[PDB]
Amino acid sequence: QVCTGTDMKLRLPASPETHLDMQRHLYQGQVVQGNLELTYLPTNASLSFLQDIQEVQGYVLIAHNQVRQVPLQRLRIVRGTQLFEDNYALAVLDNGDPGGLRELQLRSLTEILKGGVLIQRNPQLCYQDTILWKDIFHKNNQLALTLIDTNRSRRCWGESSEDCQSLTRTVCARCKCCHEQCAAGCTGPKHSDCLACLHFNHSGICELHCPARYTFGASCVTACPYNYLSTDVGSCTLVCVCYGLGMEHLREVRAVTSANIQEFAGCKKIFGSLAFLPESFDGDPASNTAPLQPEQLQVFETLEEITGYLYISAWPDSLPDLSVFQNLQVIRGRILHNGAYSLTLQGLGISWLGLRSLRELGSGLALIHHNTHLCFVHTVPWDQLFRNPHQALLHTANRP
Amino acid sequence: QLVESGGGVVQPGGSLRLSCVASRIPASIRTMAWYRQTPGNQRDWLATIGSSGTPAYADSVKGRFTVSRDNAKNTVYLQMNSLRPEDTALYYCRDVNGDYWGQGTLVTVS
Description:
The structure holds two protein chains of two kinds.
Chain A: E1 2-3, H1 19-24, E2 31-32, E3 36-39, E4 55-56, E5 60-63, E6 77-78, E7 88-93, E8 111-112, E9 116-120, E10 147-148, E11 200-202, E12 205-207, E13 214-216, E14 219-221, E15 229-230, E16 236-237, E17 269-270, E18 274-276, E19 305-306, E20 310-312, E21 330-331, E22 341-346, E23 360-361, E24 365-369, E25 393-394
Parallel strand pairs in A: 1-2, 2-4, 3-5, 4-6, 5-7, 6-8, 7-9, 9-10, 17-19, 18-20, 19-21, 20-22, 21-23, 22-24, 24-25
Antiparallel strand pairs in A: 11-12, 13-14, 15-16
Chain B: E1 2-5, E2 8-10, E3 16-22, E4 32-36, E5 44-49, E6 55-57, E7 66-70, E8 75-80, E9 89-91, E10 93-95, E11 100-101, E12 105-109
Parallel strand pairs in B: 2-12
Antiparallel strand pairs in B: 1-3, 3-8, 4-5, 4-10, 5-6, 7-8, 9-12, 10-11
Subcellular location (chain A): Cell membrane; Cell projection, Ruffle membrane
Protein name (chain A): Receptor tyrosine-protein kinase erbB-2
Family (chain A): Belongs to the protein kinase superfamily. Tyr protein kinase family. EGF receptor subfamily.
């Protein structure tokens, strides 16, 4: 019913080989609590897993694609909580080569609450200018930053007669008038008939505020999901001591260099991420940053729980395993690298993992690839670490 | 910043050897992987080579292609053998420890 989005923008995939396997594991069977980003898909890719998606909380990015068409048929409303380049809630860019996307096919797309539309540099995309946008954008937030390119090489979404565009706002905020709490159309005059609640969905009943039930996303849920914190106000949020990367002091720090390693000593729970990069172990000549030493990594031998991701793209060649994390037990996956992964190990050259205490990954996928020395990847009980029917292990380029 | 060199036109049954020279000299020789993008498809993995030197080849090209490196010049080669008309595509080298990508060198077999 409810899934989470992804947070890479125009960046080449971390694994081009398992990109479609990553997507399918995320949007398999309705509401996306984040950004829907579909980039670098091959022309023969099958996207039958996107058929049931209904609403997107953030923005919809479809860029650098080669597919014939993306089947987001039932997509109703993209709320635009987050925006691409802080202006656009829908962004279609460079779909093709200088095949490519053919038609939008967003047949039921009715409301974009906050944000704009950006369509540019599409070699063979059509019907990008015959569809009105002012009838889709919400009245309250009319920041319709529209930048559409009309150049092509080949009042509806597509050529088919089933792609009829139902003008809603132009023909009350919404009508067919709808109830004040109904976002995307309605089939009647009551408050239990519309097909997308504007503010909250209390068991099929659209209301402005949750009955002080628990608010979560845009639905009045009876109890918060597994990996969500419940506050006294009544909200299911992710954040209400040590602080990891991207948390209240290191919001702009990208790696665990030698500058910010002393503050983790003696810690038993990091409220953030843990990113290891090539520049952590070779300090830049610009600043007096001594290269990190394998002996200085022992400050993580007391860690027990990490509230974010554990990303390793560089490791000292003297260390043959991750035994410095033999005490870490749970990765909460509340903050995921690129918005999708909670455990990544790429190009490390380790001979065995050594995460003997890991017993749960609260959210996000797992990438263990390009470790051409690494055995003991299958022997780990991965199904006993996952907690959702959306997590999977993606592994390529490893030791045979 | 990675630049490859060694592609071009070749006869079927021939051989080729690409290179991938790093513009900067890293402190550690890192890990570089070889890909191949047939037009319209995702760039398929070919081979990977680590800092130590242990390689890993895909199933399709294992036994024909050979990957190696020279730490003196920080260049990684991809020695191709018994080339075949189906092998024509764009060949790119990526730096796995950093996610830096090359620009590609088109290899044509005819």
